[PDB]
Each structure stands twice: as C-alpha cells, then as structure tokens.
C-alpha cells in the first residue's frame, strides 16, 4: 500500500478439546449440546463389560 | 448363624486374564460384593506413562521433521498409547535418550528400556516410518500416577523453550466382570455362585490389583464401623 512502509504479521494457533457447553450433531437432525461428562464406571454397561 | 463361604478359586488362563469364583453365599449379598469390587478396581488403581518430550530440531507441536513420514503431532499422539511395566519398586521418574540413526521403521520395543529401572510390555507397536536416511533424537520422561491428567496441567515442568508436555492415561486396567447364579441342593437353598473376570494390561497380575482394591475398601469401612465420635 502506497502510504505505508511495511506490514508485519504473526500467526497464533490453538489446540481445542471438548468440554461442557460444546455443541454436537449427527446426520439426521439431532442437534444437541453436551450436558455432563460422566465417569466411565456408572455408565450403563452391557453384559460384556 | 452365618453361612460363611470358603470357596475362593483362581484359574488364570494367562499372565494377564484371570477368573475367580466365590462359593457358597447368602442370597442378595454377592451382587453387593461384586459391584463394590468392580467400581473400586476400575476406578482407582495406579500406573505409569510418558509425559514430556524433547525432539531435536523441532520447537512446537505443529512442526515437521525432514525425512519422517508423520507429523510431530502424530508421534506424540501414538506415544500416548504405549503401556509399560516396572521390574523394580521405588522407581519414581525416569528420563530416556533414544538415538535412532539407521534406515528403519521405528517401533515400540525398539525402545531400548535402557534404564535398568523399568520396561515396556507392548513391543510390537509402530511409532513411525522413517525413510532410508532420517536421523532422529528423542528424550523421554516416564512417571507414575492415577486416573487421568490432561496436558496443560503438565505445563508445570519447565518447557525450557523446547519441552512439549503430552496427555497421560495412567489406568492399569482394561476390563472387569462379575456374574451370579444360584446353586442348590434338593429342598435346601441359598447357594450362590459368583464368577468374576479381570483383564489387565499385563503390568500386574489380577491378584495384586484385586487384593489392593479390597485393602482400600476395608480401610474405609474400618473407621466407619468401630470409631463412633458423637456430636
């Protein structure tokens, strides 16, 4: 640009996980949001552990 | 009267998978016993994993090394999955120095467990595919812990402009079973079968973990039965 001498720049990146409040969806309309991150124990577990 | 069992049998198909059976029992009582064991076993045991990495010639988690087919991200990601074992007690934390300098495919067991204090169970995992000419230097830290810890907490250890902290899943257990079914004599009842299964990583036989879980659970109930401090 004519009136300016230089332009400097930086890039900033963020590695982003999941946490409560994020949105999820599927292929049939099931919009939703994460409510609770349950520990693995008390999830309902089938007859094969 | 109290129909005490005495039948505790082990069968141990392998170094890592084992069965157990409990015989004979008073009704409605084994479900309690087993579900308590399942929770404590699968929740609160102790293990080891790797936490920190220092690669030569790379400064951050998005670089790339010349001649190595994967990113640094995938190196860290699959290094996450390598399950370990002790051979000696009292091994707190360890640092390792790998110098892969030949036309190779860099695999897990290729890690010389060069420290005398510790070893690798799963040897046959593919870390990465080098070219004919890549030279790679890596430095490890392995440490003990419980449950699960994310990365940014592991920012505690002094990145020093190079160190990259990684996630760490410490749990030493993979699968647990219990099931119950009646057994009987004619006209006289109240025989119970408990059949239980422990599937681990191989870092420890099922018996030690099962013993430790029971030790903690009894240690809890001990205070809550005898001592009776009052308001």
UniProtKB/TrEMBL annotation, chain A:
Signal peptide: none annotated. Transmembrane segments: none annotated. The RNAP catalytic core consists of 2 alpha, 1 beta, 1 beta' and 1 omega subunit. When a sigma factor is associated with the core the holoenzyme is formed, which can initiate transcription. DNA-dependent RNA polymerase catalyzes the transcription of DNA into RNA using the four ribonucleoside triphosphates as substrates. Belongs to the RNA polymerase beta chain family. This is DNA-directed RNA polymerase subunit beta. The chain holds residues 1026 to 1074 of 1269 of the full protein.
């Amino acid at each position: 640009p004519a009136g300016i001498v230089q332009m400097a720049k930086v890039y900033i990146a963020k590695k982003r996980k999941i946490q409560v409040g994020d949105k999820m969806a599927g292929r049939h309309g099931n919009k939703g949001i994460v409510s609770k991150i349950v520990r693995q124990e008390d999830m309902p577990f089938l007859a094969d552990g | 009267a109290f129909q005490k069992p005495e039948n505790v049998l082990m069968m141990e198909t392998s170094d890592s998978i084992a069965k157990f059976e409990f015989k004979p029992l008073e009704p409605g009582y084994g479900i309690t016993i087993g579900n308590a064991l399942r929770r404590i076993l699968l929740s609160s045991l102790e293990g080891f994993a790797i936490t920190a990495i220092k690669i030569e010639g790379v400064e951050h988690e998005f670089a790339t090394i010349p001649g190595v087919l994967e990113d640094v991200t995938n190196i860290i990601l699959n290094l996450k999955q390598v399950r370990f074992k002790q051979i000696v007690p009292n091994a707190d934390v360890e640092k390792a120095t790998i110098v892969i300098s030949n036309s190779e495919v860099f695999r897990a067991g290729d890690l010389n467990a060069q420290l005398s204090n510790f070893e690798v169970l799963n040897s046959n995992l593919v870390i990465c595919h080098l070219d004919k000419s890549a030279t790679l230097t890596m430095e490890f830290s392995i440490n003990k812990g419980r449950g699960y810890v994310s990365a940014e907490e592991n920012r505690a250890e002094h990145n020093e402009l190079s160190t990259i902290a990684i996630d760490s899943i410490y749990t030493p257990i993979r699968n647990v079973k219990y099931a119950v079914e009646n057994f009987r004599v004619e006209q006289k009842t109240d025989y119970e079968k408990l059949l239980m299964e422990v599937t681990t990583d191989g870092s420890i036989r099922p018996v030690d973990a099962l013993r430790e879980a029971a030790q903690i659970l009894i240690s809890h109930f001990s205070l809550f039965a005898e001592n009776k401090i009052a308001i």
